[PDB]
Amino acid sequence: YDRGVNTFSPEGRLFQVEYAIEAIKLGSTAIGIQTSEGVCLAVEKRITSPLMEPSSIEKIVEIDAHIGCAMSGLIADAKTLIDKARVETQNHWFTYNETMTVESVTQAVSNLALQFGEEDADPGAMSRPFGVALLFGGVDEKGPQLFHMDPSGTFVQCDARAIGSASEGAQSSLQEVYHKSMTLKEAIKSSLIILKQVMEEKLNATNIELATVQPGQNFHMFTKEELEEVIKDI
Amino acid sequence: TTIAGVVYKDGIVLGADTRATEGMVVADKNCSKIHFISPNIYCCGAGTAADTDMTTQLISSNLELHSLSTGRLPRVVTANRMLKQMLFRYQGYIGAALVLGGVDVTGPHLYSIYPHGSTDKLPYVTMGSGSLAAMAVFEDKFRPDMEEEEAKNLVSEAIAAGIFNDLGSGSNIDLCVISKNKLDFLRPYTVPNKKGTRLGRYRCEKGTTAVLTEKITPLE
Amino acid sequence: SRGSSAGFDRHITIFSPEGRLYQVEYAFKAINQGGLTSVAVRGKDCAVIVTQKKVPDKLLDSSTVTHLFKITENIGCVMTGMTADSRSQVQRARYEAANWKYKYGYEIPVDMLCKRIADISQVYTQNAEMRPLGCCMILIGIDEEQGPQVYKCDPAGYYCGFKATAAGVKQTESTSFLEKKVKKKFDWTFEQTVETAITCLSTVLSIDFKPSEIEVGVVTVENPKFRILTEAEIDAHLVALAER
Amino acid sequence: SIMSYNGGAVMAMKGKNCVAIAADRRFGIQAQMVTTDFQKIFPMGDRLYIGLAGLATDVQTVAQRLKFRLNLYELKEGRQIKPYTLMSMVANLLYEKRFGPYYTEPVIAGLDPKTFKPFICSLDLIGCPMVTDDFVVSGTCAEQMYGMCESLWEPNMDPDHLFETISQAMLNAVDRDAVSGMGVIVHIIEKDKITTRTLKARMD
Amino acid sequence: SRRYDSRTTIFSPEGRLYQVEYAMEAIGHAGTCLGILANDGVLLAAERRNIHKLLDEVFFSEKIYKLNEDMACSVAGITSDANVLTNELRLIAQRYLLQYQEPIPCEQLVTALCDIKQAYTQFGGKRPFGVSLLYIGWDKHYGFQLYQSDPSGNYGGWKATCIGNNSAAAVSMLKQDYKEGEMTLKSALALAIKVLNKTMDVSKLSAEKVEIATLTRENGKTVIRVLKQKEVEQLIKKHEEEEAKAEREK
Amino acid sequence: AERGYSFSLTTFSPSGKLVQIEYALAAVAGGAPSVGIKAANGVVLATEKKQKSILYDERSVHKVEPITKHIGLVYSGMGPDYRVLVHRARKLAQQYYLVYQEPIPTAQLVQRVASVMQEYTQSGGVRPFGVSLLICGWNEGRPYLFQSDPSGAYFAWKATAMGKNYVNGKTFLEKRYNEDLELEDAIHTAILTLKESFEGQMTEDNIEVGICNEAGFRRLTPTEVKDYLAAIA
Amino acid sequence: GTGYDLSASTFSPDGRVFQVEYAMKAVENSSTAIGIRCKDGVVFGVEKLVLSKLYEEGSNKRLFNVDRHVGMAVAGLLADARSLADIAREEASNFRSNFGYNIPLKHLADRVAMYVHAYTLYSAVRPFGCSFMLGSYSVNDGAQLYMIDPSGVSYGYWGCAIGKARQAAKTEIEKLQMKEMTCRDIVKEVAKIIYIVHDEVKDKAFELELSWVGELTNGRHEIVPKDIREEAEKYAKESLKE
């Protein structure tokens, strides 16, 4: 026998979605910590040769001038959701003339995230679910927020989350370092310490990407000398 | 054009003249207005000459198809009901004006179909531009269930009267006799007036129109 | 080859290695499912149908089980087999034979009606998305250019015209009995055809009916309206089988 | 109309074993002439010409869309095209666009390839087959050319004498029209050879 | 339903298209068809797959379709699908003429076909066209050209090649005998007959086993004639003398 | 209700066959035998029309359908699938006659019908037609005989058989056929070569014979066939 | 079966279509509903099982209005029942627009069978797991009661039952005469049949749902007033002890 893409397991959960969840456990590692002074997103730009240009494989994007996003898993699928969000925050700004709250953009890309149809569907619908996890981390009018989003098309707000291939070892190490008084400078060092354990490469000013979003600034990605400036302290 | 039909006791006689006028200038001095639908159903077309051709031809091809499948000859009723429901679908821009008349195994029938999809089953009809000129001849000299030969001379008589009292009509008179055993479709029948003879010679002989160039392409 | 399976040829309607279509051979075994038999005999001035009427209960109303349907004013039929498919194909019959009159202006021949009903059925044989309808229609009616006619289409789609036929379970016992009485050639009046039909069903089931167990649909040249005989008139012909 | 908008004139004249077809060449925008060489006659396989007068745009589309439906019929079947068919193929390409017509009147002038029987017919702009045996014309000098042919035609001409007549009847017809002239060209098809002579005329 | 579906537009675990692989087998055991390029023309010879003495032979040719007024092609494979692609080629090539008003360049014609073979391999879940073709033509950017297309959706140019049974043995024969940059239309015909003896069962051939059609340029127009049975016989009868002189080496 | 299946059911096998078209041919070769003889003057199509009883009627159905006023069919294979191709052909013929105002040539009407049969070996959810056609016709001064296979190819013959025992009939014809046979004399040759495969006595109801000369295709009425069986005219 | 039951598009080597027969069992696993046609109307009885004290009594109905003068009583998978009831509603509203009167019950029966039949021919669908009965009174046609099953077959009935105890209750209806009683007399005998065929050893409890449609109400379909329902349940407990 063979089962289509819409089939519940006797367990209770959809086959395809159960497997999209395993597709993350191959991906990069990303650790976002959310504080009272802003959200910081750190990820590892897993290179594979020295020939590869480390500066053209980024996995933090600007969704708008106040909503960063760091994905891990199948980066090729991601370029379809991300583009749909930028279009989403913009449409929203075209009608209401304000920024979109970070909660609502997470919600619009999560509707897209579950809807595929072997039969009885458009010609442009997706044949399978998306193999990504995202970490939207903007600042808006409820203060800084951070949202985790999984290929099941569900989203839960967070405080500090790790996704990817080293989620378990990083998640335990987050529960012991994260408290509510944490500042944005203490948080960036907490990220790279936990990231430095779980990377089986090495910490280097081209092997990570660091970007913040702060209530007083826009989305700002750290250049290469501002990464070197925070690897001295680690 | 003048079209006319009569029913006599054995069949039908469809007549029409042959002139076709494009403007106030005769375009064709011989032009059959009598189109073959089936082996036993002719139809005459007035109005825009190009709209009747492509309406009758299309029906002919749904009647030729239709008869092979039933495997018997096709009725006049049927062609009448196809032309009516095709023309009605275009709400009158198809300017066909049809005198449909065949002989079935339920007697001769004779319909007239006006552009708009209206039907009028009758015993003698006239369509065309000198149609009125013809309808007068029929009001005197028509009597029910006449001889075959009294009819032939009636319908030519009505088309002749439509020829002389009209500008859109002239030249030969076509007759079609449909009966349940023969089909005497005779294209010349009467020729009221012919062109006269050139009284002199106006032609000229080679060496009279200047040429600039010329070139010969031989074939095989 | 020779009676061999090869792939999905016993589930959908594709060819098999020996050359047959098993999803159609199978639809015929569904005609014998219904457990009904219907004879239709042609005469020199009429055509006849006679059917078994079976009401398992006395709750079931006896008058809304029937298998004689008026297709139009001049075209009766009799549906044999899987009853759901029956009504579905009679719906489609009525529809065409009425559509016909709309596009040509005269009552449809019984010939053609069946042609077009068979042509809809064949389409199911050649596509793989559906099974053929599991029923078998018999049409009767009086043409005016060739007398009384009997046609009978199949789930494969092969209506041929007949002089006398049956359908259903006991189909082989009936054609045996009939063909001996088509070689003698009687005078086949109205009375002798209604007689041949009843006594052909009676001996193949071995019943001898009461007027409540058969229903007779008949169509004549004096009166081309498709009539269904009432239980009073059916019993007059049944007590005349007892005398003879 | 909007087919006096470019002038044009085509005339085809049946001889005895030969058929002639003549056009003028002046392509102009109402009054202002653009060029004096602009073909209104096209070959459609040898020994079969179609001429198109009228609106210059539909001239070229009809000639290009007819070469695309003729070439595809002359390959998919091997038989070369027969002139009585080519007429009905053109009647059907105009009537394909009944509503929103083309503004051209074709003039088909060929010999049957299997035999040699000459053949001429014009068409109304919506697609009507008008077969004669005298001579057909279409254009904007319609009235003028009818006059000239009705008096110079004769039932049987040799191919040298035919060319004198079509020439006489095309030079005098196009001279009495504003929006035509600037020289006429004349094919005259015989069984063996196709002659193409250009007449010296008014460069008025 | 997915139960009855035969996925035909899906990769193999080794990175192949099974349906395209099997299409090669339908062409492998089909009628032979070679074409050899020259300078004074170019010609398609092909085995006549069907032979008998009840066939009527009232065709232009069994294998050679004329695509344009400048291009022909010979097929090899499932005759059913040939009648489709040769009529969809004629439509491409007249459609290029309606739009550019000039004949279609020989290269382009073929690629526009093989965008249609390509599609049937990548989505639709249809079976692919089980035919391969040769094209001979003449254009004004390259002169004479020969091309060959696979049911893969893949085309190549060639100066001589062969599809259909024993194609391997043919191409080996051609690769010794073909002289590069020099070759007249009379030497290519005598080379063609020499390769058909080697591929065919009957080692003398007949005039009825082959059909040879050249495409020359004669006076600006292109000419594509299929040689009569008299011309072809003289190429077979003159090849029996080349073997009566090749038996002498002592 | 289904949109239809889209995937093809004809498909290649590792050897290079289109297994479905292979089986369709075996349905054909199980059918009622039929022969064709082009008589350099006319074409003759004959086929056997045996029934399972005396109950059937013979003036209900025919195996010699006319397509135009000079093109006839016969077949062997599946009587349903045959009635579909007959109908499609008549629309093609008429469609053609509507656009060129000529009657469809027979070379043309074989390619057009062939393509339809071809199309059903490459569309979704369908099987091939279990039929082969013999398409005689008298166009352009000659006769013609073709034969369309469930594959979608065709061949122009001067004689042939098909259906039951076509290997026996094809060799009987290869021997007993001489070009420039008369049209009358072909009819004797047709019914003759149809007599080998056939079983039982011949009558005027058992064979359908249809000629095709410059006068047009037609069926021979049961009376004419009774004088060909005897051979007394 | 092996491939002889996956699809609705596959005849069995018998001639049977197991997917239509399998839908029949979904009716056998549902409680009973009986319909009894008297001479001046119809009466519908549904053995609705009460499964918890968490459900509001007088809800989760199985008696519908397909039109203002037609009842429908269902047995089987309720989801499909609420799907059929909207196709009918739609059909009988449709009919009132184009023909301008109430749709005769004999006809509505056929249209809804048609629509049920079309779901036994394709792979894209499964048959309905739902049987039902249509009941209607007019003063120009009489009382009528049709019953449609997954196959798509309709028949007329004088009395009909569907559900897990269709055998037992058909017998108890055949003892009853009906061609001479009025509604007021039958409604008590319906309730009585239901109590006899129901098991209080297989089910906790049950609620008896009764429906007129007849001369009493003026051809309208309506549930039975609370008063006549209490009387018909009281008359059924006494005849059950005896």
Curated annotation (Swiss-Prot), chain B:
The 26S proteasome consists of a 20S proteasome core and two 19S regulatory subunits. The 20S proteasome core is a barrel-shaped complex made of 28 subunits that are arranged in four stacked rings. The two outer rings are each formed by seven alpha subunits, and the two inner rings are formed by seven beta subunits. The proteolytic activity is exerted by three beta-subunits PSMB5, PSMB6 and PSMB7. (Microbial infection) Interacts with HIV-1 Tat protein. One of its GO terms (cellular component) is nucleoplasm. Keywords: Cytoplasm, Host-virus interaction, Hydrolase, Nucleus, Protease, Proteasome, Threonine protease, Zymogen. Component of the 20S core proteasome complex involved in the proteolytic degradation of most intracellular proteins. This complex plays numerous essential roles within the cell by associating with different regulatory particles. Associated with two 19S regulatory particles, forms the 26S proteasome and thus participates in the ATP-dependent degradation of ubiquitinated proteins. It comes from Homo sapiens. Transmembrane segments: none annotated. The active site is at residue 1. It catalyses: Cleavage of peptide bonds with very broad specificity. One of its GO terms (biological process) is proteasome-mediated ubiquitin-dependent protein catabolic process. Its EC number is 3.4.25.1. Expressed at a low level in colonic mucosa. Up-regulated in colorectal cancer tissues. It is found in: Cytoplasm; Nucleus. Disulfide bonds: none annotated. This is Proteasome subunit beta type-7. It comes from the Eukaryota.
From Swiss-Prot, chain C:
InterPro entries: Ntn_hydrolases_N, Proteasome_alpha, Proteasome_alpha-type, Proteasome_asu_N, Proteasome_sua/b, Proteasome_subunit_alpha6. GO terms for cellular component: cilium; cytoplasm; cytosol; extracellular exosome; mitochondrion; myofibril; nuclear matrix; nucleoplasm. Keywords: Acetylation, Cytoplasm, Glycoprotein, Nucleus, Phosphoprotein, Proteasome. SUPFAM superfamilies: N-terminal nucleophile aminohydrolases (Ntn hydrolases) (SSF56235). Glycans are attached at residue 4. The modification N6-acetyllysine is found at residues 101, 103. It is found in: Cytoplasm; Nucleus. PROSITE patterns: PROTEASOME_ALPHA_1 (PS00388), PROTEASOME_ALPHA_2 (PS51475). Belongs to the peptidase T1A family. Component of the 20S core proteasome complex involved in the proteolytic degradation of most intracellular proteins. This complex plays numerous essential roles within the cell by associating with different regulatory particles. Associated with two 19S regulatory particles, forms the 26S proteasome and thus participates in the ATP-dependent degradation of ubiquitinated proteins. This is Proteasome subunit alpha type-6. It comes from Homo sapiens (Human). The lineage of its organism: Eukaryota, Metazoa, Chordata, Craniata, Vertebrata.
UniProtKB/Swiss-Prot annotation, chain E:
It holds the Pfam family Proteasome. The modification N6-acetyllysine is found at residues 126, 175. GO terms for biological process: proteasome-mediated ubiquitin-dependent protein catabolic process. Its main location: cytoplasm. Keywords: Acetylation, Cytoplasm, Host-virus interaction, Nucleus, Phosphoprotein, Proteasome. InterPro entries: Ntn_hydrolases_N (IPR029055), Proteasome_alpha (IPR050115), Proteasome_alpha-type (IPR023332), Proteasome_asu_N (IPR000426), Proteasome_bsu_CS (IPR016050), Proteasome_sua/b (IPR001353). GO terms for cellular component: cytoplasm; cytosol; extracellular exosome; intracellular membrane-bounded organelle; nucleoplasm; nucleus; P-body; proteasome complex. It is found in: Cytoplasm; Nucleus. The keyword DNA-binding does not apply. Component of the 20S core proteasome complex involved in the proteolytic degradation of most intracellular proteins. This complex plays numerous essential roles within the cell by associating with different regulatory particles. Associated with two 19S regulatory particles, forms the 26S proteasome and thus participates in the ATP-dependent degradation of ubiquitinated proteins. Belongs to the peptidase T1A family. This is Proteasome subunit alpha type-4. The gene is PSMA4.
Swiss-Prot record, chain G:
GO terms for cellular component: cytoplasm; cytosol; extracellular exosome; nucleoplasm; nucleus; proteasome complex; proteasome core complex; proteasome core complex, alpha-subunit complex. Pfam families: Proteasome, Proteasome_A_N. Keywords: Acetylation, Cytoplasm, Host-virus interaction, Nucleus, Phosphoprotein, Proteasome. The modification Phosphoserine is found at residue 239. SUPFAM superfamilies: N-terminal nucleophile aminohydrolases (Ntn hydrolases). GO terms for molecular function: ubiquitin protein ligase binding. The modification N6-acetyllysine is found at residues 53, 202, 226. InterPro entries: Ntn_hydrolases_N, Proteasome_alpha, Proteasome_alpha-type, Proteasome_asu_N, Proteasome_sua/b. GO terms for biological process: proteasome-mediated ubiquitin-dependent protein catabolic process. SMART domains: Proteasome_A_N (SM00948). It is found in: Cytoplasm; Nucleus. The 26S proteasome consists of a 20S proteasome core and two 19S regulatory subunits. The 20S proteasome core is a barrel-shaped complex made of 28 subunits that are arranged in four stacked rings. The two outer rings are each formed by seven alpha subunits, and the two inner rings are formed by seven beta subunits. The proteolytic activity is exerted by three beta-subunits PSMB5, PSMB6 and PSMB7. Interacts with AURKB. Interacts with CDKN1A. Interacts with MDM2 and RB1. Interacts with the C-terminus of TBXA2R isoform 2. Interacts with DNAJB2. Belongs to the peptidase T1A family. This is Proteasome subunit alpha type-3. It comes from Homo sapiens (Human). The gene is PSMA3.
